[PDB]
Amino acid sequence: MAVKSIKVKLRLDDMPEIRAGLWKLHKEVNAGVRYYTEWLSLLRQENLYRRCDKTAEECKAELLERLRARQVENGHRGPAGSDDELLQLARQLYELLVPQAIGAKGDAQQIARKFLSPLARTADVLRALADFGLKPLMRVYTDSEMSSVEWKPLRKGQAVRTWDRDMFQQAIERMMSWESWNQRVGQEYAKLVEQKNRFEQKNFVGQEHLVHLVNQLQQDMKEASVTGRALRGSDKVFEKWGKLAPDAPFDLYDAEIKNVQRRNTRRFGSHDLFAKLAEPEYQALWREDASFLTRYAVYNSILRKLNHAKMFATFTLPDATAHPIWTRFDKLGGNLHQYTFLFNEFGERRHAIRFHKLLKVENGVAREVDDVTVPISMSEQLDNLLPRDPNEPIALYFRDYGAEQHFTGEFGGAKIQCRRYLNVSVRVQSQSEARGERRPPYAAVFRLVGDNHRAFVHFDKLSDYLAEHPDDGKLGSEGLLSGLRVMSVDLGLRTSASISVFRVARKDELKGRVPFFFPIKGNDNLVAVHERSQLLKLPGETESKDLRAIREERQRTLRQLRTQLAYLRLLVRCGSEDVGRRERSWAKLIANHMTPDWREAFENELQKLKSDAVYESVRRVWRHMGKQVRDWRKDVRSGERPKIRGYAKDVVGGNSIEQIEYLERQYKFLKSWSFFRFAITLREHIDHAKEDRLKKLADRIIMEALGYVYALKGKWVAKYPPCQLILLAELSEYQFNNDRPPSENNQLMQWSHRGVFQELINQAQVHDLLVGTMYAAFSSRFDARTGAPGIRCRRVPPWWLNKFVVEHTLDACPLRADDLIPTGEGEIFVSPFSAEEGDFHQIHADLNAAQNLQQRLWSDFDISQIRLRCDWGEVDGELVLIPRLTGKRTADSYSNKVFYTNTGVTYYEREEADEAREKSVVLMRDPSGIINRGNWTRQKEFWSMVNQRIEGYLVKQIRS
RNA sequence: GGUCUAGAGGACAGAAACGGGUGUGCCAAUGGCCACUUUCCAGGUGGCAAAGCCCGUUGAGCUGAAGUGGCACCAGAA
Structure with a gap:
């Protein structure tokens, strides 16, 4: 239901x-x-x-x-x-x-x-x-x-x-x-306190004073005005400061801070911390323990999540205006005040609803009346509702694009609403629910476990299902009882969804090529055959030459205004007394991404101050932006631009994440500019565009799982047999050397993956589509076909290329187009096929991660087969590693086992969701036996080994 | 056509006035004027009104026929 x-x-x-x-x-x-x-x-x-x-x-x-x-x-x-x-x-x-x-x-x-x-x-x-x-x-x-x-x-x-x-x-x-x-x-606050208490008693035992000295440091910051983001480059500072002395001039400590920025300006910040960390008071934090600040930066994140949580709920009484509660009704046949939905009582598409018990006033008296038919404004949602029984004014047929047989339904309750309207809930009955079946016939092959619908397979009853339900090749919603197909979806940044369809068939088949296939655990006769894989792109994710020019100019004006505020916030420091505000910010400001109008006025007030004094300049330039930010705000609020008429491909931003970040970057700019309710019209527009993306992206995945294709003039056509198990990606809070930051560092991605999950469960309840998730850790790093890991790269026709030359000093040698260049967020995925350097296996990066989830589905994959966190123990004399039992399945194969080593980079074995770091080392493995012959290699050494294989060759083929 | 496998909608770089309706919003899609918020900027607040909006009806236009809107929606609450 x-x-x-x-x-x-x-x-x-x-x-x-x-x-x-x-x-x-x-x-x-x-x-x-x-x-x-x-x-x-x-x-x-x-x-x-x-x-x-x-x-x-x-x-x-x-x-x-x-x-x-x-x-x-x-x-x-x-x-x-x-x-x-x-x-x-x-x-x-x-x-x-x-x-x-x-x-x-x-x-x-x-x-x-x-x-x-x-x-x-x-x-x-x-x-x-x-x-x-x-x-x-x-x-x-x-x-x-x-x-x-x-x-x-x-x-x-x-x-x-x-x-x-x-x-x-x-x-x-x-x-x-x-x-x-x-x-x-x-209860959530109790588990958050347990997370802080148990983390506090594991890292700060003998370091009781160092915690109190950090609270000295953090209180020194706020009164004069420590996370992992503000400690970027700490080991570089602590390595070069160890070559210095305490009783040295403070310029020497500052000299080492400016040198470490030359290596990477992308990952560095907070010069005030290292300046206050170099003080003779706060030296025991980085000298007694060379990793205390890094261990404490995670402890601050636990308190950060603890502070943003309460131990009680807020009670509010139902006010008739502030916290309204709507007058409920009942379906025609209940025990309270009922309502009757009238179909076409005033016209062809003019509906009405009569209330059996209502109220009417004329001057000052209000009396209860009976049978009050009220017409209803036309809606496209009501067009999908048709009456099923004139004698049962509740039964109705529900139309949907993903089904040619209208679902039998029944009207539900009703409640009159207002905005700071009548909500008619329609109980739609799925196809399997109409046949008398509670769960669909294919709900026994899989086992969705827990909250996130962990999809596990029952391979015993899989052979019995294909013999009962052979493939007759029926398209659309009619083929839900035909065969068995699983679609793996990998929500990505560039492409909205990369899907791959795998059907289960026995023996083999097939103008002369052989389709790709994946082995299924248990059954040796049937094997998951790849049926189709495509990129599902919402309007706004296609990149062309003219579209980029449009996207560049609409962001360049905000690029200029946003970076200007950073220079104004540098000028407000020079109008203070502290050396960090006056001295340090002065020497910094004493390549054309600014407005030439404001840039000329900014250099004028600078040179006048080079010869309270800055308070006049910091408020004369602030008025200059007020002219620029207003002429730009009204240009965005009311300016006229081309708009899509009808159906137009090659849209500017559309439903892409770029359009969502653009709406957010404006709200984040107006909030940061005015503060040198808030934007109720823009904020409500951001949530609407965000809500519109989740609804559209959840329907396109479902319409593809059912086999419907929107073709052109604009009509849904059942073109493929339907899938039966939408395999999503498992979502987790922690990330460990997996995704390139953009698709995870962006805290918007987590909202997208969370929002798509909730909207998929709701929309798929009607089509009897099983929505399940598979563990997605390192799903983009390893290959689906060969199983070997690899680095993400992309072709060339630049944010990534200029940094690629700074790493490898390739300014001298030229290069022809379509040469593989690793970027971190590579468009394509590359992986070595054998030991021969130079020979690789290329495949679309987003589609390889989708097909990887499918390989994990038919093989009952567990992360213990790849990753494993161990602890340094002393079993049988030697200083060996001791694995950690995270999950019941990880424990079965590595209970009694213990890992030893002779070099430290390669390990051999001899016989929740919380992570504590640096106490011991992590090791991984290659299934194909390519990297380190498929042995347990340390985390850092393993990925550098993989990077040395791919990035080593394709650059050696550039210089030579 | 170039390049890459998964052989598919393949994939990245390329190239040539009248008559009705206004459920909730998206799709270059964030409303205007005035008053006030100490003064100009952002934000807010109150008041005002005309419509903007699509849809249907043709003679327009030649990008004789054609076409000048596409999409989704499961609500609610601190």
């Missing part, structure tokens, strides 16, 4: 007497839920936090005043009851109403309908509370004096109107979601 909430808009222009009754109805259920929810917070009688400690444990006295007042209100003069039975039944009824407060389970259906009418183990609390004269603990909101409107009179026989049943139930669900929220937040 898959629900789809179709939000639509009502038109009430011809009937103001119903709109005013709808806004009033919104205030009735909101003030009602607020009345029923506040009572639950008092019955909770705990801390009850907020944005602070307001109403902190003070509900005990506020409940008693609200509880004692009802004893004299209901004619009770027998057993009064001490202040214990008051608080006893208070917490006892609360844990009885919402079972999520103690860790139990309870659905809000038979809870609100059970406790409302009596109040307006279970039988003991309801009876002992009714003994204390509190038989009427709650008068309903509609019949009391709180509701200013005149509802329909409660009929003789019915206890409570359905309106208050919707308020009392909605208040229970809000408190259920609260206790599960407060507990989960406290």
Whole structure:
């Protein structure tokens, strides 16, 4: 069962007497839920936090005043009851109403309908509370004096109107979601404290004073105004400073800092730290232990994640405006106020919805009416809905491009909404759910485990499936019962998605070439045959000559304005007293990426200051940008540019990540410029374009998994048999010598991979597509066919080429086009096939990582086959390595084993998600026996060995 | 055609006025004017109004016929 909430808009222009009754109805259920929810917070009688400690444990006295007042209100003069039975039944009824407060389970259906009418183990609390004269603990909101409107009179026989049943139930669900929220937040904060405590007791044992001296250093920074990003180049500094003396002039310490920048300006920063680290006070940090600051930089990241987390949740009462709660409805046949969806009551595409119980006002009185048909504004989403049964005004057919047979569905609930509208949830029934099957017939071959849908295979029942479901070659959604196919998707930066289709067939087949295939563990007759592999590109990821020129000029103006602020922030330092602000920033500023207008004015104020004094210059140049940043803001906010009419290929940015980074880089610039709510119109536009990318990228992967192709004028065609298991990449927080930073250093990529996963699970619930993930660590570094690792390179027709010549001094020799050059983020993947240097195996980098996930799927791959973290032990005398048991499968093959060495770079063996570094070394291996004959090689030595193979040859073929 | 395997939509560099509708947003797609926010910039706030918007109907245009919009959507809440 898959629900789809179709939000639509009502038109009430011809009937103001119903709109005013709808806004009033919104205030009735909101003030009602607020009345029923506040009572639950008092019955909770705990801390009850907020944005602070307001109403902190003070509900005990506020409940008693609200509880004692009802004893004299209901004619009770027998057993009064001490202040214990008051608080006893208070917490006892609360844990009885919402079972999520103690860790139990309870659905809000038979809870609100059970406790409302009596109040307006279970039988003991309801009876002992009714003994204390509190038989009427709650008068309903509609019949009391709180509701200013005149509802329909409660009929003789019915206890409570359905309106208050919707308020009392909605208040229970809000408190259920609260206790599960407060507990989960406290549990995550408990694991974060454990992460800090156990990391603190492993690295800072004998170094108790060094931690306190770092807190001296960090407090010295903020009062005068330490992560891994700010320590880039620490070992280079500590190596050259060890050749110096403490009682040396400070210029000598500064001399070594400016030298290490000549090697790599890309990875260096924070000159103020090393200047304050060279002080005679903070020398025990880098002299007593040459790696303490690096060990502490990870400890600061744990506190960074710890500070951005609470140990309690924030409680907010449902206000009718600030924190609104929407008036719910029920499907035609429920037990509360229902609604009926009317198909084509005002026209061909003019729908309407009649409400069985509503409100209407004219001047100042509001009364309850019946059967209020309201037309509905047209929508493309409603075009996919067709009525299935005129006698059942709930059953409906759901249209979708990825299916030629319309799904049978049923209308769900409804709730009237506003923006700071009527949400009609449509329960769409999948094809397998309509056949009477809970899980699809192919859901037994795989086993999605855990939260991230870890896809594991049951090879025993695989042979039985192909014999029951042979390949008849049916295209589209009709072929879900035909054969078995798995599509591996690798979300990338340049190409939005690189996919590869593998079918399972026996023996062999096939104008005369032989298709690629992957061996499947267990069965020796069937083998995963590669069917097709293509690049799925959203509009905006195609690179041409004219498109680059458009992208360069739209960024060059922001390139000039953003780098200008960096020079203005260097000038504001020269107007201070500290040497780091005045002295160091002065000598620095005393190749044309600036605005020539502001560049000329900046050099003028500099030369005038070369001969509070800078405070005038720092505020005269700031006004100059105000002229430039305004003429540029209005040029972006209201300037007219060409826009796509119809369907146009070769788009500028489109749905690419470049368009998302552009919208973000503007928000990050306006936030950094004004601070020398915020941009509500731009921020909401960034989230919309980001939300639009996730929805479009999740549908294109699914439409490809089903075999539909959008061809040109614009029509989806079922061109391939459908896949049955969308194999995604496993997502993890840590990265260790795997992806080139851009596709991971960009904290946007993690949002993309997280957002695509959530949207894929939702959209694939209708098509019965199994969404699973495979471990993606080092999926782009190793080859899929040969299994040998390699460096990422690309061709040549430059950000990467100029740095490639600085490394290898290739300014003299020329080169012909289409020569392989490693960049780190290479467009193509290269790998050695044999021991012959010069002979390599080239393949698209993003597609090789996708096909690598497939090889991991049919072979039950584990990272223990490649990577392994060991500890330095002393087993049987020698100083051998001891592997670490991360995961049950890693432990099976390396339990009793132990790794020894004679050189330190090559290791031989003799018989969570947290990582502590540098305590011992990590080693990896090559499956093809090419690099180091397939032995366990140290991490740094192994990748340099691979780089020496590929990058060694293709450069030796350039100089010669 | 050059280069690269996975042999596919292959892959990187190349080259030649009237009548209706305005669910939520994307696709070079971030609204304008005025007032105020101490003063110009960013951000915010309030007020104002005309429409901008697509879609349908042709005589326009020759890029006699053709074509002047494509795409996706599962909501909600601190």
